[PDB]
Each structure stands twice: as structure tokens, then as C-alpha cells.
Design an enzyme around this catalytic site. Structure first.
Site, PDB file in Angstrom:
ATOM      1  N   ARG A 239      -0.482   1.923   5.373  1.00 41.86           N
ATOM      2  CA  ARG A 239       0.092   0.332   5.992  1.00 41.86           C
ATOM      3  C   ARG A 239       1.470   0.667   6.369  1.00 41.86           C
ATOM      4  NH1 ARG A 239       1.139  -5.339   4.428  1.00 41.86           N
ATOM      5  NH2 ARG A 239       1.987  -6.640   6.662  1.00 41.86           N
TER       6      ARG A 239
ATOM      7  N   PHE B 256      10.718  -1.826   7.076  1.00 35.58           N
ATOM      8  CA  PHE B 256      10.054  -2.878   5.871  1.00 35.58           C
ATOM      9  C   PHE B 256       9.436  -2.316   5.381  1.00 35.58           C
ATOM     10  CE2 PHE B 256       6.893  -6.008   4.785  1.00 35.58           C
ATOM     11  CZ  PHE B 256       7.528  -6.098   4.272  1.00 35.58           C
TER      12      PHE B 256
ATOM     13  N   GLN C 265       3.035   1.173   2.705  1.00 31.13           N
ATOM     14  CA  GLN C 265       2.044   0.881   1.140  1.00 31.13           C
ATOM     15  C   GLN C 265       1.024   1.734   1.287  1.00 31.13           C
ATOM     16  OE1 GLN C 265       0.696  -3.174   1.361  1.00 31.13           O
ATOM     17  NE2 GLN C 265      -0.723  -2.824   0.093  1.00 31.13           N
TER      18      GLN C 265
ATOM     19  N   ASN D 129       0.269  -6.586  -4.000  1.00 33.80           N
ATOM     20  CA  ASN D 129      -0.801  -7.881  -4.752  1.00 33.80           C
ATOM     21  C   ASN D 129      -1.212  -8.437  -3.701  1.00 33.80           C
ATOM     22  OD1 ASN D 129       0.599 -10.445  -4.910  1.00 33.80           O
ATOM     23  ND2 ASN D 129       1.955  -9.080  -6.091  1.00 33.80           N
TER      24      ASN D 129
ATOM     25  N   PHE E 169       4.420  -0.332  -2.678  1.00 34.08           N
ATOM     26  CA  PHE E 169       4.634  -0.018  -1.841  1.00 34.08           C
ATOM     27  C   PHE E 169       6.363   0.374  -2.275  1.00 34.08           C
ATOM     28  CE2 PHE E 169       7.370  -4.203  -1.328  1.00 34.08           C
ATOM     29  CZ  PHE E 169       6.431  -4.750  -2.505  1.00 34.08           C
TER      30      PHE E 169
ATOM     31  N   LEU F 257      11.003 -10.541  -1.685  1.00 34.72           N
ATOM     32  CA  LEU F 257      10.151 -10.833  -2.338  1.00 34.72           C
ATOM     33  C   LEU F 257      10.392 -10.568  -4.063  1.00 34.72           C
ATOM     34  CD1 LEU F 257       8.578  -7.294  -0.591  1.00 34.72           C
ATOM     35  CD2 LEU F 257       7.683 -10.185   0.124  1.00 34.72           C
TER      36      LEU F 257
ATOM     37  N   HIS G 221       6.608  -9.415  -6.095  1.00 33.92           N
ATOM     38  CA  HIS G 221       6.249  -8.354  -6.663  1.00 33.92           C
ATOM     39  C   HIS G 221       7.307  -7.630  -7.798  1.00 33.92           C
ATOM     40  CE1 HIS G 221       3.493  -8.069  -3.122  1.00 33.92           C
ATOM     41  NE2 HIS G 221       4.358  -8.515  -2.286  1.00 33.92           N
TER      42      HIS G 221
END
EC number: 5.2.1.8
Length: 165
Positions: free
Chosen positions: A55, A60, A63, A102, A113, A122, A126
Site C-alpha cells: 500500500r 502520503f 506501508q 495498527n 509505514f 497521526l 501511531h
């Protein structure tokens, strides 16, 4: 005591792309760092070697770390199933930040990531545990194989990984 370094060699459909290296903040998130390191050396009998970045979203993040199901639904720590969110001391300050993916609160596994931009929303959700040290340009290369929904136009794999020294 100096923080551990690990490397990934990335391939794009079998073709070597290059190497990314990471510093792991064992000094500030010791447990989270040791998980990622151990998973990178394969020293517990399993790990990231051969797994994919499943992904990737341009501007961005990238991951990976789902080495058991290869698509986001699997993975496991060296502590068993999942482990707790250790602290939110470190922030998503910018590109190159390495953070645990997660499912919910205290559901940390093997998934992680790498930011390609500042991701402040975030902060506190995270656990940030390392940062790219060399090869940010390789993450930027990976990044062009993602898309708006994360599905990658080619297959991106960790061809090899381990600990630098």
C-alpha cells in the site's frame, strides 16, 4: 549508546531499485525498535525478508511489513500477537519518518509505514520509532508506483534486509 541501523533492499518486479537504511530509536522506543530490528534480521525465525509494500500513496506514505498475508490483514510481532502503543514522544515531523501501522489502540504487529510528507494528524495515534537515514530518494522512487488508493502499479518487495553492523 548508538541507535541500531537496518537496511532494506527494494526490488520493483524482481529488478533491484536500491537500498533504504533506517535509524531505530531504541533510546526512546526501545521495545518497538527491537521488534522492527529483529524482524529485519530474521533472527527469531521470521521477518520482513521477501515481503512486499502492499500500500503506497503518493505524497502520503509507503506501508509494508505484512509478511504473513501480504496485503495488510496479517503480520506479527516478536512478542506474540500484537503489542501496545509504547509512547507518542516522537512526532510525525516529516518525510522519512518510520511509524507503526495498527488496527486500533495497542494493536502493533509487524506492519509499518514510511512517511513521504509531514503527517501530523497521526501524532499520538501511531508510534514513531525510527527514520530514514540513507536512501530517501529510493522511497521517493517507490512512491511513484503507488496511487491514490494505495494499490501499487508494480510489485515492490524487500529483496533483502538486515542490520548494518
Amino acid at each position: 549508546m548508538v541507535n541500531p541501523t537496518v537496511f532494506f533492499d527494494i526490488a520493483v518486479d524482481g529488478e533491484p531499485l536500491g537500498r533504504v537504511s533506517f535509524e531505530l530509536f531504541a533510546d526512546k522506543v526501545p521495545k518497538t525498535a527491537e521488534n522492527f530490528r529483529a524482524l529485519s534480521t530474521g533472527e527469531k525465525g521470521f521477518g520482513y525478508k521477501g515481503s512486499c509494500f502492499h500500500r503506497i500513496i503518493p505524497g502520503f506514505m509507503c506501508q509494508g511489513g505484512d509478511f504473513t498475508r501480504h496485503n495488510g490483514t496479517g503480520g506479527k510481532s516478536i512478542y506474540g500477537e500484537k503489542f501496545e502503543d509504547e509512547n507518542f514522544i516522537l512526532k510525525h515531523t516529516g518525510p522519512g519518518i518510520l511509524s507503526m501501522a495498527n488496527a486500533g489502540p495497542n494493536t502493533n504487529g509487524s506492519q509499518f509505514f514510511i512517511c513521504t510528507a509531514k503527517t501530523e494528524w497521526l501524532d499520538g495515534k501511531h508510534v514513531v520509532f525510527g527514520k530514514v537515514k540513507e536512501g530517501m530518494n529510493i522511497v521517493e522512487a517507490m512512491e511513484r508506483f503507488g496511487s491514490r488508493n494505495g494499490k501499487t502499479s508494480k510489485k515492490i518487495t524487500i529483496a533483502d534486509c538486515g542490520q548494518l553492523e
